[PDB]
Amino acid sequence: YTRTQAQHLFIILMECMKKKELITVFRMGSEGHQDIDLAILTALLKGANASAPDQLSLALAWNRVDIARSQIFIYGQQWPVGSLEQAMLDALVLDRVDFVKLLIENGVSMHRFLTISRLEELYNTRHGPSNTLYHLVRDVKKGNLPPDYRISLIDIGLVIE
Amino acid sequence: ISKHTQLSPTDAFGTIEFQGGGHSNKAMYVRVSFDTKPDLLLHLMTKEWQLELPKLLISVHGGLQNFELQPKLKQVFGKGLIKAAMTTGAWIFTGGVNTGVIRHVGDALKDHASKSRGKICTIGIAPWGIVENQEDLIGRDVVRPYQTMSNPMSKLTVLNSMHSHFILADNGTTGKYGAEVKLRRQLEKHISLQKINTRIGQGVPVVALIVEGGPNVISIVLEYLRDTPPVPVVVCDGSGRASDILAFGHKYSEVTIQKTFTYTRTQAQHLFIILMECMKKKELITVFRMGSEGHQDIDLAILTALLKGANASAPDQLSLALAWNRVDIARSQIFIYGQQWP
């Protein structure tokens, strides 16, 4: 394949196999990773060398609940204090029902999570589909609404009434 | 110290709500001393909790350390245990804390409640000194919230959800086991002698299920086999712990240099004397193997062991099968060639 045995790329090959921690091999009909999409996505979590909250954030951004179920939520992951709460908040803003269900199943309690400030933040988000809440708030206030107005829970009570 | 503790009255009983996973699970709980008489415990379990007398008792023993089971084995084990405990009115005695085989029983119960009706009377007898929150549970006869989230650095473990009732036994210590084995054995002995509704004279059958294990599982198996009424046991081969060692020892009954597993204090310390005593009383040991042998179903393995292990006559086996409302067990075991009915 090359210029006989006189020319070889074995030095480069042995350097690559010395750094074989990142190399992933997909073998058809083999032990693990029979799917290409699973082989690619699982390599991005191990190869990132980040913490569990960062892996959960990546899986939440990719909207892949099976990757987080089979890799991130495993035996003894040692989540930092206050990480699952922020993960639940991010999944709640981005309209990720599967991730909310998975996080509720995997430890978080909605009674301690939901506070007045968190609900206020949830009512003033931008990540999500279109909604007519701002028009209703403007209509209840009879106009004269300053730009970049934070919607308080009192206005939400008024619009509910 | 030499157990110089204050004999104060109990101050924590009622119902706990497991805030956490996506289930609305209630669980009665009391805290009692480890010297409590089994008669009062049975009285409280029968009248204060409105639990009818069981037709069967299943005792689960396993390793304290959190092990993992391979796939395609824990699924059939859980399905068989759930089917045996649901088709028959029975109680399941477990450790209670979310460690070891108790987690397997918990997920087996979790996977059953999502597809079928009915409830299983799972009872956890756990020491009081290992709960992650000794507080937040002291409300007498009132609902107490409980959190299922676990912190690995807390050096304790959380109470396992999907359990119907809890019996918390304390000897005054905190952070150590050994405060519930004697009480659990005494309660099993007292409920075994309790009389079933049939007027033949037979009591509640008791079986033992062994998954994983350790240096003390062989001892508890031996003390089960040495009881005045013998208690049949059922072990599994795919666990890898002393249950697997006992399953291997089931082959070639009655090889001593094969005991070196780097699991005890070299070859100088061995449990082979109690192991060979158990294998000498191997007439009641039952091994469940997938594909290699018969009895591929856990519920069939448990129920058929209770008829052979009872060592009673055919009318008593028929009465037991009638009480359990299992017609297939009576069809396949009791009604065979040459049974000599009185």
Side-chain angles (χ1 to χ4, degrees), chain B residues 46 68 76 89 124 130 139 148 161 194 212 228 281 306 317:
Chain B
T46 311
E68 292 84 7
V76 289
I130 326 289
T148 333
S161 58
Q194 200 66 31
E212 206 73 17
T228 306
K281 271 188 171 56
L306 296 145
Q317 296 184 355

Coordinates of all heavy atoms in Angstrom, one line a residue, chain B residues 46 68 76 89 124 130 139 148 161 194 212 228 281 306 317:
Chain B
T46 N -51.9 -6.6 62.1 CA -53.2 -7.2 61.8 C -54.4 -6.2 62.0 O -55.3 -6.1 61.1 CB -53.5 -8.4 62.5 OG1 -52.3 -9.3 62.4 CG2 -54.7 -9.2 62.0
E68 N -25.0 -4.9 40.8 CA -25.8 -4.7 39.6 C -26.0 -6.1 39.0 O -25.1 -7.0 39.0 CB -25.1 -3.9 38.6 CG -25.0 -2.4 39.0 CD -23.8 -2.1 39.8 OE1 -22.9 -3.0 40.0 OE2 -23.7 -0.9 40.3
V76 N -36.9 -11.3 34.5 CA -37.6 -12.5 34.7 C -37.8 -12.7 36.2 O -38.8 -13.2 36.7 CB -37.0 -13.7 34.0 CG1 -37.3 -13.6 32.5 CG2 -35.5 -13.8 34.3
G89 N -52.1 -14.3 48.0 CA -52.1 -13.3 49.1 C -50.9 -13.6 50.0 O -50.9 -14.6 50.7
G124 N -40.8 -3.6 55.0 CA -39.4 -3.4 55.2 C -39.0 -3.3 56.7 O -39.6 -2.5 57.4
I130 N -29.6 4.0 59.9 CA -29.1 4.1 58.6 C -29.9 5.0 57.7 O -29.5 5.4 56.6 CB -29.0 2.7 57.9 CG1 -28.6 1.7 59.0 CG2 -27.9 2.7 56.8 CD1 -27.2 1.8 59.5
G139 N -43.2 13.1 63.4 CA -44.6 13.4 63.6 C -45.4 12.2 63.9 O -45.6 11.3 63.1
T148 N -36.7 11.3 48.3 CA -36.1 10.2 47.7 C -34.7 10.5 47.1 O -34.0 9.5 46.8 CB -36.9 9.5 46.7 OG1 -38.3 9.8 46.9 CG2 -36.8 8.0 46.7
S161 N -38.7 3.5 48.4 CA -40.1 3.7 48.1 C -40.7 2.5 47.5 O -40.0 1.4 47.4 CB -40.3 4.9 47.2 OG -39.6 4.7 46.0
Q194 N -48.4 -19.3 63.2 CA -49.8 -18.8 63.1 C -50.6 -19.7 62.2 O -50.1 -20.2 61.2 CB -49.8 -17.4 62.6 CG -51.1 -16.6 63.0 CD -51.2 -16.4 64.5 OE1 -50.3 -16.3 65.2 NE2 -52.5 -16.4 64.9
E212 N -27.7 -12.7 45.3 CA -26.3 -12.2 45.7 C -26.0 -12.8 47.0 O -26.3 -14.0 47.3 CB -26.3 -10.6 45.6 CG -24.9 -10.0 45.4 CD -24.4 -10.2 44.0 OE1 -25.3 -10.5 43.1 OE2 -23.2 -10.0 43.7
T228 N -36.4 -26.1 63.4 CA -37.2 -27.3 63.7 C -38.2 -27.6 62.6 O -38.3 -28.8 62.2 CB -37.8 -27.2 65.1 OG1 -36.8 -26.9 66.1 CG2 -38.5 -28.5 65.5
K281 N -27.6 -30.9 53.8 CA -29.1 -30.7 53.9 C -29.6 -30.1 52.6 O -30.5 -29.3 52.6 CB -29.4 -29.8 55.1 CG -29.6 -30.5 56.4 CD -30.2 -29.6 57.5 CE -30.6 -30.4 58.7 NZ -29.5 -31.3 59.2
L306 N -42.5 -24.9 47.9 CA -43.3 -24.9 49.1 C -44.1 -26.2 49.3 O -44.6 -26.5 50.4 CB -44.3 -23.7 49.1 CG -43.6 -22.3 49.2 CD1 -44.3 -21.3 48.3 CD2 -43.5 -21.9 50.6
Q317 N -51.3 -30.7 50.4 CA -50.8 -29.9 49.2 C -52.0 -29.4 48.4 O -52.0 -28.3 47.9 CB -50.0 -30.9 48.3 CG -48.7 -31.3 49.0 CD -47.8 -32.1 48.0 OE1 -48.2 -32.5 46.9 NE2 -46.6 -32.5 48.5

